[PDB]
Amino acid sequence: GNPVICMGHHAVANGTMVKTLADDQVEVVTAQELVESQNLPELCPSPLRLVDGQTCDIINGALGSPGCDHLNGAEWDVFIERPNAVDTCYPFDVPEYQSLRSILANNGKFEFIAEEFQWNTVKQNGKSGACKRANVNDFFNRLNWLVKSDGNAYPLQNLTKINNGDYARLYIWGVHHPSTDTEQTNLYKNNPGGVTVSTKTSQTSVVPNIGSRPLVRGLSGRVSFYWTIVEPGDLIVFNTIGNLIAPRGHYKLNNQKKSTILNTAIPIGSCVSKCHTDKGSLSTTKPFQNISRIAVGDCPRYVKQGSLKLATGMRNIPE
Amino acid sequence: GLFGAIAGFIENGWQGLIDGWYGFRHQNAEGTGTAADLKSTQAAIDQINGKLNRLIEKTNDKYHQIEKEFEQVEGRIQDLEKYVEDTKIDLWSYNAELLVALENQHTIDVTDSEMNKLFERVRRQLRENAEDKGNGCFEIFHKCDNNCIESIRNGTYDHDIYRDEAINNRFQ
Ligand SMILES: CC(=O)N[C@@H]1[C@@H](O)[C@H](O[C@@H]2O[C@H](CO[C@]3(C(=O)O)C[C@H](O)[C@@H](NC(C)=O)[C@H]([C@H](O)[C@H](O)CO)O3)[C@H](O)[C@H](O)[C@H]2O)[C@@H](CO)O[C@H]1O
Numbered sequence: 001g002n003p004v005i006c007m008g009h010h011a012v013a014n015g016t017m018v019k020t021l022a023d024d025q026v027e028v029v030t031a032q033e034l035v036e037s038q039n040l041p042e043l044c045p046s047p048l049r050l051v052d053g054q055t056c057d058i059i060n061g062a063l064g065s066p067g068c069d070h071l072n073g074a075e076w077d078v079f080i081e082r083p084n085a086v087d088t089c090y091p092f093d094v095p096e097y098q099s100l101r102s103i104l105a106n107n108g109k110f111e112f113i114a115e116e117f118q119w120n121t122v123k124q125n126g127k128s129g130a131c132k133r134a135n136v137n138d139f140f141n142r143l144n145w146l147v148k149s150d151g152n153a154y155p156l157q158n159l160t161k162i163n164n165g166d167y168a169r170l171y172i173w174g175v176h177h178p179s180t181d182t183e184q185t186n187l188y189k190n191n192p193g194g195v196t197v198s199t200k201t202s203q204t205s206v207v208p209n210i211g212s213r214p215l216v217r218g219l220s221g222r223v224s225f226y227w228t229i230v231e232p233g234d235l236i237v238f239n240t241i242g243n244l245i246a247p248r249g250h251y252k253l254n255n256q257k258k259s260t261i262l263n264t265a266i267p268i269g270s271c272v273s274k275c276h277t278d279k280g281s282l283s284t285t286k287p288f289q290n291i292s293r294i295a296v297g298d299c300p301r302y303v304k305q306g307s308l309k310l311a312t313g314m315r316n317i318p319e
Numbered sequence: 320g321l322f323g324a325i326a327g328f329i330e331n332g333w334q335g336l337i338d339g340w341y342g343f344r345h346q347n348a349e350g351t352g353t354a355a356d357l358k359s360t361q362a363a364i365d366q367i368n369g370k371l372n373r374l375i376e377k378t379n380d381k382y383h384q385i386e387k388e389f390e391q392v393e394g395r396i397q398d399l400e401k402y403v404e405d406t407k408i409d410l411w412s413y414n415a416e417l418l419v420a421l422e423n424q425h426t427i428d429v430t431d432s433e434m435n436k437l438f439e440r441v442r443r444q445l446r447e448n449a450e451d452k453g454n455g456c457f458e459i460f461h462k463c464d465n466n467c468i469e470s471i472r473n474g475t476y477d478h479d480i481y482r483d484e485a486i487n488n489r490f491q
């Protein structure tokens with residue numbers, strides 16, 4: 001008979017199902033998964049700079065609570081904050097906590113610059129058994145607890161720090177809250193006390209809270225922490241008739257702030273990756289991931305789907 | 320697919336074709352053979368890997384964002400933070416779903432197309448010397464030994480050489 005030539009295409013025994021606009025189950029010869037659904041059980045310490053807070057969350061790091069000394073001088077792209085972090089110092093709150101946490105994290109460094117504050121006649125360096133350092137009663141190492149003199153004097157304090165440097169300064173300060181009027185007067189003769197902090201374009205007044213409170217770390221007393229950013233050319237004025245927890249200097253702010261924080265228990269390993277989730281680092285080239293919406297660095301985009309297969313071959317029709 | 324070749328007038332693929340995506344299968348007086356076509360194969364692959372590469376680096380380098388997990392309800396600001404993130408995820412999940420469906424629809428049409436181009440290329444080489452049998456095959460109306468077949472596969476087949484023999488076989 002006459003010769004015959006047939007044109008055709010390849011096939012395999014069993015291909016991969018993909019979706020199209022029309023059909024939702026079409027078999028093709030090859031396909032590639034586009035959703036990353038696997039993570040590493042560790043965080044990669046390179047190429048991004050990670051700082052592990054360990055026992056100390058970022059706020060206690062800034063205040064200088066006991067156990068947070070490894071964080072002095074630290075610089076990070078991503079601060080790794082541990083869910084099992086523990087308080088080690090005086091019972092405290094921060095009225096706009098998340099905002100201060102954001103600022104510290106985003107700034108990306110703990111660079112403290114000590115200054116001499118010439119407090120008048122009041123005694124300095126008050127300590128507590130709720131804040132033991134090396135088994136000895138102590139305090140936040142960035143703060144200076146002021147109380148009245150031995151001759152029962154807590155006069156109006158009034159000092160100024162002038163920013164003539166080339167960087168914005170972050171001052172963290174506090175206000176102590178006794179449990180009774182007697183305690184108030186016993187610590188700072190005046191009642192009420194009061195803290196007033198001002199800059200060129202802002203001024204704040206805090207009136208101390210006095211009331212019985214649950215025992216935290218053995219105490220009913222509290223400190224509330226505040227902060228003031230002082231731009232170059234501006235300055236800060238501290239005023240007190242009592243209850244001030246004074247700063248021992250300021251933290252330096254980077255002009256450009258591009259770091260962040262990641263709260264996770266995942267251990268830091270020895271792998272290489274620029275994408276970190278709260279479940280661990282991703283090591284992938286896929287455009288999407290379904291592991292966590294919490295993702296930092298150079299990451300695939302988070303989606304709800306567990307799988308999306310991209311066809312990389314023709315329809316598979318075996319036999 | 321749009322051209323109706325693959326899963327169409329070509330009934331099935333060839334599992335024995337292992338060194339290409341498309342190819343030729345022949346029968347003549349001295350035997351049978353299957354050979355891959357490189358040009359059609361490379362054209363399909365080039366278009367598919369092209370998609371792959373465009374896909375696998377847009378830039379998503381993000382550091383400081385917003386909180387996305389919360390312990391207790393807070394009200395207004397927390398509601399907005401959660402709504403913004405949920406809004407973002409739905410839109411990106413929609414993008415991902417549509418993207419894969421469009422790409423796959425196109426990929427399948429591209430491969431069906433490249434199969435048809437190969438068929439048409441060969442049809443044109445053969446001129447009046449062959450007839451389409453309807454299944455992706457041509458009946459060749461002249462003796463075509465292994466060298467002849469190879470000439471068709473490599474695009475040096477000169478239809479004029481066999482035309483008188485073929486016309487006579489076709490129409491009488
Ligand atoms: C100092 C005084 O005149 N009164 C004495 C009481 O302090 C004392 O009461 C007990 O207080 C215990 C905790 O004392 C602290 C602390 O936090 O460790 C002791 C600190 O040295 C002190 N720091 C200062 C003054 O800057 C700190 C501070 O006053 C408070 O924390 C502010 O709220 O007090 C603990 O609460 C015990 O449960 C309580 O009995 C009594 C009894 O020992 O003696 C008084 O002389």
Ligand SMILES: *[C@@H]1O[C@H](CO)[C@@H](O)[C@H](O)[C@H]1NC(C)=O
Pocket residue numbers: 158159160
């Ligand atoms: C202290 O406060 C007084 C107002 O009573 C003001 O005149 C003076 O400039 C201030 N000086 C300091 C220490 O900043």
Ligand SMILES: *[C@@H]1O[C@H](CO)[C@@H](O)[C@H](O)[C@H]1NC(C)=O
Pocket residue numbers: 037290291292305306307
């Ligand atoms: C991600 O997708 C995989 C399937 O690929 C699935 O097993 C897993 O449950 C998904 N993860 C989440 C957090 O939904």
